[PDB]
RNA sequence: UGACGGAGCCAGCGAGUCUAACCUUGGCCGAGAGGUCUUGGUAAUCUUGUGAAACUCCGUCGUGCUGGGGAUA
């Protein structure tokens, strides 16, 4: 009610492709840098 | 031997049904 | 439906030409302007449609 | 009350754009002024109405 | 509202419609300019209606050509036929008849297949 | 037609025979196809469908 | 192996040629991808 | 909860000993777990393989297998920036686009392509129009079924276009993730196969550990779009090589 | 319809081939609005509607 | 007149509620018929329309044939 009173008185997402959000790979910090 | 055990198990399950 | 070929239907007589109108792809101004009423009016529209199709199918 | 406020501000914006279009198609000399973004406006010639 | 003229150029199954009207001088084939008409070795087959009579005839008119059908060389022959007889028909209708038949004489002295195709064939011997 | 025969020798034995679909569309077997063995080419009264069965009534 | 890929194969120093033949002798521990070699 | 007991270890050992000696399966080198869920998992099968993250065993490095990459219409940007980067310049066996892919490979060329590669990876904007281009050989079963990748780390807003760039470090990171993890595809019924481990690149405790990893990620409650699909009691596990019988584990 | 196309007789004038017209591919344009209305409406009509 | 590797481009035919594979690995439900899911292999002039190939352009190479058991890593 405090946020609603302030208003009243003041993870990828492709739009065309809904299969991307289960599709794409969960990349890590251990994946981007070192020797392959 | 467990391989032959379980394939005989599914075989006689279908035969019994 | 009867799908008459374009090579035939471009070479048809003037009386025999087939009036086939293309669909509209542009959100024209009169269609984006025109108002439809809601609630009691949309259930009146639904009711009149149900009555008219029951009458036509009975006939 | 909050969604009454959202409906009222969206109606104010769409009536403001409608009024700008209506004001634009009356008469007088005018030019299309383009800003940094692409929000266009129409600046009217300094000429009073006869 | 504008003085405009429409002609047709045909070879085997290519066909080109040319609209000529008064303008600033732009010659456009299929939306792109005339200086893009491939196969680029027959671009002078397309150009010769311009170079046979001078660009001062084209300095006041704008042509547009729409070419469908055919292949590469049939399309360049349709383009050059459409351009040639469109220039002749424009100078007939909206410029004087003396420049009209001067253009007809120049194109016919080069080759009359700029103006009249060879259309119905074979011969049953 | 796929499988009423096992070999092109069998189809060669049965060439020219009149078959029919279950729709009563009459037909005739014409020639054994080469690479798939019991498959042959038949000609019918008109276009048969993929949901049909041809029939060679023998005794 | 850092040898320039435009040199003709005659003018090769022996450390360059031994680097070439060492890489082609043990491709796995030089992490060459396994689809290059069959 | 925890699935590592003598039943699981004996079944998996006996499967390896069977496939070493049996002359009917000396070509398929793979272990799959069949999860028999309790209920029917409701989500229909699109052919998009969701990614099951293994926690401590990279089952494949991106250099020990052939990778085909399928790109958008002009393909010059992706081909140049992928092949002269030297973060990714040797990682792909092939980079093509959909137009000339369906131009070149028609008919038995697709069977040669199937036997040629073993990781098909498509741009996610073209991943959906692949089952006509690649045929049904890539979509019957699931061993060469193509993976979605995002090539640019950029998101599309409405009323404006995705700026066409690509990021080679990002695409190496997600191919590393794809080869490092395993995958599954949801369907309607209660059967679900997940590939876990190889026949000589792996061993019994690591295969058992990543089996338990896939179990945890699948019957988890969070990670709900990607992984939380087993809503009910997971009833049975089986292990099999593709021509081998279903050795049972965890009959609940 | 194929026989009528073979027997078109191209010296066929009607008075309705002033109003009726033909697209680029040669087929018939049928205006999907009216034929008792007009598709484009005038500037003062647009002023009143807006 | 080649071989690799990219790119530009140009047709006319053809529209029946009709157009189109096979063999397996297993899970679950069912009395059964079967259903549904899963899985590897083989075959392929794909599937209805958009699109052809020869052609054109741009980088790269560089013109003396084919075999199995033997034998070197």
Residue F27 per-residue DSSP state? E
- Please list every residue in chain H whose beta carbon sits closer than 8 Å to the beta carbon of residue A12: 150, 155
Alpha carbon distances (Å) from H65 to A23, A36, E4, G38, H93: 21, 14, 65, 11, 9
List strand residue ranges (DSSP E) for chain G, in order.
none
- Please list every residue in chain H whose beta carbon sits closer than 8 Å to the beta carbon of residue G28: none
Query: Count of B–H CB contacts within 8 Å?
Result: 20
- Give A17 to chain H, closest Cα distance, Å: 7
H79, closest nucleotide (Cα–C1'):
J6
> Helix axis angle, B2-16 relative to H6-21, nearest 10°?
100
Q: Do chains C and D touch (3 or more CB pairs under 8 A)?
A: no
Is the minimum CB–CB distance between G38 and chain H shorter than 8 Å?
no
Question: What is the SS3 assignment for chain A?
Answer: CHHHHHHHHCCCCCCCCCCHHHHCCCCCHHHCCCCC
Contact H62, H176 (CB under 8 A): yes
Burial of H4 (0-12, 13-18, 19+ CB in 10 A): middle
Contact H248, H11 (CB under 8 A): yes
Separation CA H165–CA B17 (nearest Å): 61
Separation CA H28–CA H170 (nearest Å): 33
Residues in chain C, total: 59
Instruction: Select from C10, C14, C33 the Cβ nearest to the Cβ of I26.
Output: C10
Helix (H) / strand (E) element for H69: namely strand H67-71
Secondary structure of residue F53 in the 3-state scheme: coil
Q: Which two tokens stand for residue E53?
A: 């009579």
- I27 - beta bridge partners? none
Is the minimum CB–CB distance between A7 and chain D shorter than 8 Å?
yes
Is the minimum CB–CB distance between D20 and chain I shorter than 8 Å?
no
Alpha-carbon dihedral sign for residues H104, H106, H112, H117 = positive
- Please list every residue in chain A whose beta carbon sits closer than 8 Å to the beta carbon of residue H169: 32
Helix (H) / strand (E) element for E17: namely strand E15-22
Helix (H) / strand (E) element for D34: namely strand D30-34
> Helix axis angle, H6-21 relative to H204-218, nearest 10°?
120
Separation CA I31–CA I42 (nearest Å): 18
Torsion (CA) D15, D16, D21, D24 in degrees, nearest 10: 140
Residues 6+ apart with CB under 8 A from E78: E9, E10, E11, E14, E15, E16, E67, E69, E70
Q: After which residues is the backbone of chain D broken at C–N > 2.5 Å?
A: none
Residue H145 CA to J34 C1' — how many Å? 30
Separation CA D7–CA H76 (nearest Å): 47
Separation CA C28–CA H249 (nearest Å): 64
The answer to whether the bond into C26 is cis (omega within 30° of 0) is no
E75, closest nucleotide (Cα–C1'):
J10
Q: Would the CB atoms of D21 and I47 count as touching at under 8 Å?
A: no
- E19 - beta bridge partners? E6, E64
Neighbours of H208 (CB within 10 A): 21
- Give D10 to chain A, closest Cα distance, Å: 15
Q: Give me the numbers of helices (H) and strands (E) for chain C, helices first please.
A: 3, 0
Q: Which of I25, I28, I38, I45 to mutate to test the interface with C (most CBs of C within 10 A)?
A: I28
Neighbours of H122 (CB within 10 A): 24
Separation CA H87–CA H89 (nearest Å): 6
Burial of G20 (0-12, 13-18, 19+ CB in 10 A): middle
Separation CA E110–CA E80 (nearest Å): 13
Chain centre distance of CA H54: 12
Separation CA I21–CA E52 (nearest Å): 37
Q: Which nucleotides of J are covered by protein (CB under 7 A)?
A: 6-16, 18-22, 24-28, 30-32, 35-47, 49, 51-57
Residue E52 CA to J48 C1' — how many Å? 47
Separation CA D40–CA D33 (nearest Å): 6
Contact H12, H247 (CB under 8 A): yes
Residues 6+ apart with CB under 8 A from E75: E11, E14, E16, E67, E69
Residue H64 CA to J69 C1' — how many Å? 33
Separation CA F8–CA F15 (nearest Å): 10
Chain centre distance of CA F4: 7
> Helix axis angle, E72-93 relative to E43-51, nearest 10°?
10
Q: Which of A19, A22, A32, A35 to mutate to test the interface with H (most CBs of H within 10 A)?
A: A22
Return the partners of chain H (3 or more C-beta pairs < 8 Å).
Answer: A, B, G
Beta pairing, strands E27-29 & E61-68: parallel
Provide φ and ψ at H2, rounded to 5°.
-75, 130
Q: Which two tokens stand for residue E3?
A: 């003085």
Q: Which of H54, H150, H151, H227 to mutate to test the interface with A (most CBs of A within 10 A)?
A: H150
Contact H32, H245 (CB under 8 A): no
Q: Which two tokens stand for residue H169?
A: 């470090």
Chain centre distance of CA E66: 11
Q: Do chains H and B touch (3 or more CB pairs under 8 A)?
A: yes
Secondary structure of residue F36 in the 3-state scheme: coil
Chain centre distance of CA H204: 21
Domains and CATH numbers, chain E: 1-125 (3.30.230.10)
Separation CA E9–CA E75 (nearest Å): 9
Return the partners of chain B (3 or more C-beta pairs < 8 Å).
Answer: H
Separation CA E111–CA E48 (nearest Å): 11
Separation CA C4–CA I1 (nearest Å): 8
Alpha-carbon dihedral sign for residues C42, C47, C52, C53 = positive
Secondary structure of residue F42 in the 3-state scheme: strand
H-helix segments, chain E? 43-51, 72-93, 97-110
Q: Would the CB atoms of H90 and G31 count as touching at under 8 Å?
A: no
Contact H91, H173 (CB under 8 A): no
Separation CA G37–CA E121 (nearest Å): 61
Radius of gyration of chain D (CA): 15
Contact D43, D30 (CB under 8 A): yes
Contact I14, C14 (CB under 8 A): yes
Alpha-carbon dihedral sign for residues E88, E93, E99, E104 = positive
- H240 - beta bridge partners? H32
Q: Do chains D and I touch (3 or more CB pairs under 8 A)?
A: yes
Helix (H) / strand (E) element for H195: namely strand H191-195
Separation CA H180–CA H56 (nearest Å): 10
Separation CA D14–CA H214 (nearest Å): 52
- Give I28 to chain C, closest Cα distance, Å: 6
Chain centre distance of CA H120: 9
Is the minimum CB–CB distance between D1 and chain A shorter than 8 Å?
yes
Per the rule left: phi > 0, alpha: psi between -120 and 50, beta: everything else, H96 is beta
Q: In what order do the strands lie in the sheet with F18-21?
A: F40-44, F26-32, F18-21, F54-55
Contact E90, E57 (CB under 8 A): no
Residues 6+ apart with CB under 8 A from F9: none
Separation CA H39–CA F38 (nearest Å): 45
H73, closest nucleotide (Cα–C1'):
J7
Residues in chain A, total: 36
Separation CA H204–CA H212 (nearest Å): 12
Chain centre distance of CA F47: 14
- Give B8 to chain H, closest Cα distance, Å: 11
Q: Which residues of H179-189 are buried (b: 16+ CB within 10 A; e: fewer)?
A: bbbbbbbbbee
Of E80, E85, E118, nearest to E103 by C-alpha is: E85
Separation CA E83–CA E63 (nearest Å): 8
Separation CA I47–CA I45 (nearest Å): 5
H-helix segments, chain D? 2-24
> Residue for token digits 């295969």?
H207
Separation CA H241–CA H22 (nearest Å): 12
- Give G33 to chain H, closest Cα distance, Å: 5
Q: Would the CB atoms of G34 and H64 count as touching at under 8 Å?
A: yes
- Please list every residue in chain B whose beta carbon sits closer than 8 Å to the beta carbon of residue H247: 2-3, 6
Separation CA E77–CA E115 (nearest Å): 11
Q: Would the CB atoms of D22 and I43 count as touching at under 8 Å?
A: no
Of H176, H177, H214, nearest to H192 by C-alpha is: H214
Q: Would the CB atoms of G31 and H65 count as touching at under 8 Å?
A: no
> Residue for token digits 């090769």?
G12
């Amino acid at each position: 009610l405090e946020d609603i009173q302030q208003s009243i008185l003041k993870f990828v997402k492709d739009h065309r492709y809904p299969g991307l959000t289960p599709g794409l790979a969960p990349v890590g910090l251990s994946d981007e840098e070192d020797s392959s | 031997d467990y391989y032959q055990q379980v394939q005989r198990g599914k075989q006689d399950k279908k035969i019994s049904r | 439906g009867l799908k008459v070929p374009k090579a035939v239907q471009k070479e048809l007589p003037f009386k025999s030409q087939i009036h086939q109108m293309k669909p509209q792809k542009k959100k024209t101004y009169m269609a984006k302007r025109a108002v439809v009423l809601g609630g009691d009016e949309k259930k009146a529209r639904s009711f009149i449609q149900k009555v008219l199709t029951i009458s036509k199918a009975k006939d | 009350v909050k969604q009454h406020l959202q409906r009222e501000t969206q109606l104010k914006q769409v009536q403001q754009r409608m009024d700008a279009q209506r004001e634009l198609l009356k008469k007088g000399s005018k030019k299309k002024i383009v800003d940094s973004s692409g929000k266009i406006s129409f600046k009217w010639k300094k000429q009073r109405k006869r | 509202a504008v003085p405009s003229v429409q002609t047709f150029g045909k070879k085997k199954s290519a066909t080109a419609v040319a609209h000529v009207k008064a303008g600033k001088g732009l010659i456009k084939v299929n939306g792109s300019p005339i200086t893009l008409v491939e196969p680029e070795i027959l671009r002078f087959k397309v150009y010769e209606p311009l170079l046979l009579v001078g660009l001062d005839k084209f300095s006041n008119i704008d042509i547009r050509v729409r070419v469908t059908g055919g292949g590469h060389v049939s399309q360049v022959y349709a383009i050059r036929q459409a351009i040639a007889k469109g220039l002749v028909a424009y100078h007939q209708k909206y410029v004087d008849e003396q420049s009209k038949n001067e253009l007809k004489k120049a194109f016919t002295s080069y080759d009359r297949t700029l103006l009249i195709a060879d259309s119905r064939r074979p011969e049953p011997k | 037609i796929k499988d009423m025969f096992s070999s092109a020798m069998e189809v060669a034995r049965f060439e020219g025979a009149q078959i029919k679909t279950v729709s009563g569309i009459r037909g005739e077997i014409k020639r054994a196809l080469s690479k798939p063995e019991g498959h042959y080419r038949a000609a019918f009264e008109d276009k048969i469908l993929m949901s049909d069965i041809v029939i060679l009534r023998s005794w | 192996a850092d040898v320039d890929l435009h040199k003709r194969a005659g003018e090769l120093t022996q450390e360059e040629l031994e680097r070439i033949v060492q890489i082609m002798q043990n491709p796995t521990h030089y992490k060459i991808p396994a689809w290059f070699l069959n | 909860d925890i699935i590592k007991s003598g039943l699981a270890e004996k079944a998996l050992k006996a499967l390896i000993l069977q496939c070493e000696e049996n002359p009917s399966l000396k070509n398929d080198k793979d272990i799959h777990i069949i999860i028999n869920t309790g209920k029917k998992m409701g989500i229909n099968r699109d052919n998009i393989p969701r990614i099951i993250p293994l926690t401590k065993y990279k089952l494949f490095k991106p250099r020990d297998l052939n990778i085909l990459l399928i790109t958008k219409d002009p393909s010059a940007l992706y081909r140049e920036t992928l092949t002269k980067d030297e973060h990714t310049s040797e990682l792909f066996k092939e980079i093509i686009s959909v137009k000339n892919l369906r131009r070149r490979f028609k008919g038995s060329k697709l069977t040669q392509l199937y036997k040629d590669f073993d990781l098909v990876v498509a741009d996610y904007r073209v991943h959906h129009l692949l089952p006509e281009v690649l045929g049904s050989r890539f979509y019957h079963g699931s061993k060469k079924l193509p993976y979605m990748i995002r090539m640019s780390k950029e998101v599309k807003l409405k009323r404006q276009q995705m700026v066409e760039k690509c990021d080679p470090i990002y695409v190496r990171a997600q191919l590393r993730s794809i080869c490092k993890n395993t995958s599954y595809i949801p369907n309607n019924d209660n059967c679900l196969s997940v590939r876990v481990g190889y026949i000589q690149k792996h061993s019994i405790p690591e295969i058992l550990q990543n089996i338990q990893d896939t179990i945890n990620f699948l019957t988890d409650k969070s990670k709900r779009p990607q992984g939380g699909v087993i809503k009910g009691g997971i009833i049975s596990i089986f292990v099999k090589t593709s021509n081998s019988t279903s050795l049972p584990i965890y009959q609940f | 319809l194929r026989e009528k196309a073979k027997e078109r007789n191209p010296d066929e004038y009607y008075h309705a081939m002033h109003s009726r017209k033909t697209d680029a591919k040669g087929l018939l344009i049928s205006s999907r609005h009216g034929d008792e209305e007009d598709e484009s409406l005038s500037m003062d009509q647009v002023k009143l509607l807006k």
